[PDB]
Structures are given as C-alpha cells and as structure tokens.
C-alpha cells in the first residue's frame, strides 16, 4: 500500500489529521491540504474520511 501527506507530516488517509467533522470545524482545510496533493492514490479515502466523516451524530 501507499499513504497521504500534509505539510511537515506523512500519515494514513482514512481518518483526518485535524479532529473529526474537520470540514464543519475548519472548512478552509483543503486550502492547506490540496495544493499539489491531488496526485496521492489515497486521496479518495482522505476525501471520504474528511466529508462523509462518520461524525459523532452517526453510529456503527
């Protein structure tokens, strides 16, 4: 497998580096996250974890 990055950091994609419901808390996240980062094969799962976040209102 392969993984995502953000600034000084490298980390697995499928949960945010910021606290969950991260787009609702800090909506300008993409303006740090996605300058050249769109090339990552993990970006699809970073996106799913960021927006369809399974936020604290949901359950599994």
């Amino acid at each position, epitope marked *: 497998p392969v993984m995502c990055l953000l600034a000084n950091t490298t980390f697995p994609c499928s949960q945010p580096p910021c606290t969950p419901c991260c787009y609702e808390k800090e909506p300008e996240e993409t303006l740090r996250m996605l300058e050249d980062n769109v090339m990552r094969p993990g970006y699809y799962q970073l996106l*799913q974890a960021s927006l*369809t976040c*399974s*936020p*604290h*209102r*949901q*359950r*599994r």
Partner: antibody
Amino acid sequence: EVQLVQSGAEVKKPGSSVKVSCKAFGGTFSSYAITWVRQAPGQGLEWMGGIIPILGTTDYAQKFQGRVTITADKSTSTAYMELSSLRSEDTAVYYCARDPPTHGGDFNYYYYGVAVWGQGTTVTVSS
Amino acid sequence: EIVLTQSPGTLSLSPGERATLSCRASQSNNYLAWYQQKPGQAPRLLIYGASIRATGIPDRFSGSGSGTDFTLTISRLAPEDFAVYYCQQYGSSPLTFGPGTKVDIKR
C-alpha cells in the same frame, strides 16, 4: 452509518389511526429516502404494498390503499407514517430503518457509498 | 416485470468455511442488494450487485454477479449465521423482493 430510531411497539383495534414514527441522524437532516418496509408475523419478506421512498410526496407501491389506507411524511430527520382504518392482518413488524430504494423506471436515482439499516417495531391489531 | 428468484430453496452447513447464495432475473441495470435476517430480528445489508460493491461491515461476507445472476458468500460462518436472506430492486410497476433463501449452522 446513519443512526436509525423508531417509536415503541403498540396494541390496536380495527377501524382507527396508527401514528408510527422514525428518526434518522448524522447527516440525513433531509431523509436519505428511508422507507416503511413491513413484514407479517413469521412470513418471508412479502413487503409494504404501501409506502416506497418519501420526502416530498407520500409515494406508495402498486398495491395498498385498495384494502387499507396508508401515508408517510418528510420532516427534518423525522419520517412519520400513518396507517388508518386498518384490520387484524395489518399486524406486522415495520422496518422504516432502511437504505435508499432507488425507483428504477419513472423519475430519479440514488447512492452506494454508505450502508444504512436498523431495528423494527410492532403494532398488535388484536381482540 | 420479472420477480427475483433465489437459487437455493434450503441449505445447511457446519461452523467454518463457505456459503454461496444466488439470485436471478432476466435483467439488472439498477442495483439489487443482499440482506440477512436472523430469526425474530430485523435485516441488515451485506452487499450491492449490478456493477459495484458496498458493505456495512468488514469483509468476511462478500459477493458478485454475472449476466442474469447475482450472488452472496460468507466466510468462516461459525457465528449466529442461522438466517434467511433476501434482495430487491424497488422501482416502477412491480419488481419486489426475492423469496427468502434460508441457511443454518448444523447442530
């Protein structure tokens, strides 16, 4: 996964209204087309001949209303269902807590990327 | 149109290994999905067919289709997998649920 809830079980008599309720939470502040499926005691899943997806019109399947009359509602996260002037055979478990049921052949279409199910609730139309 | 039909009308297996449930109609186009009912209890989602997968839970149960036919498999079915299984495609003048294929854990 979207979190799902219903009103508790009931006991009822024929010829009156039943005001069942469902609530869906985390996303879905407008219902993701949740639908009032129903199963008669111990049978295979012969389903609700009434309500299909709803949140703008009370759309049923091609069967009920003809024997017994049914409708549903579209409030924020909150999907009421009214079944009325019913008879003993309308005793069933009702599973509102269900996926989008995409209506192939007449209007518009629905997603795959998240699962959604849940518990059932019982109305006991009884003597 | 059609009415969905499931190929096993009964099945029975010990704890462990594998199952392969199956369902058919002369068309597909808009997703059917496979649902498991434990005795006395509400269904839950296992699979989507027609072209692409979805699930609620980790990949012990999984499935696929070809031409007219659509399938559901369970891996290491030792747990509470005594259940009846259904699928549906919802739309227009009737299409409806499958009949309910039942499989059990061989006491």
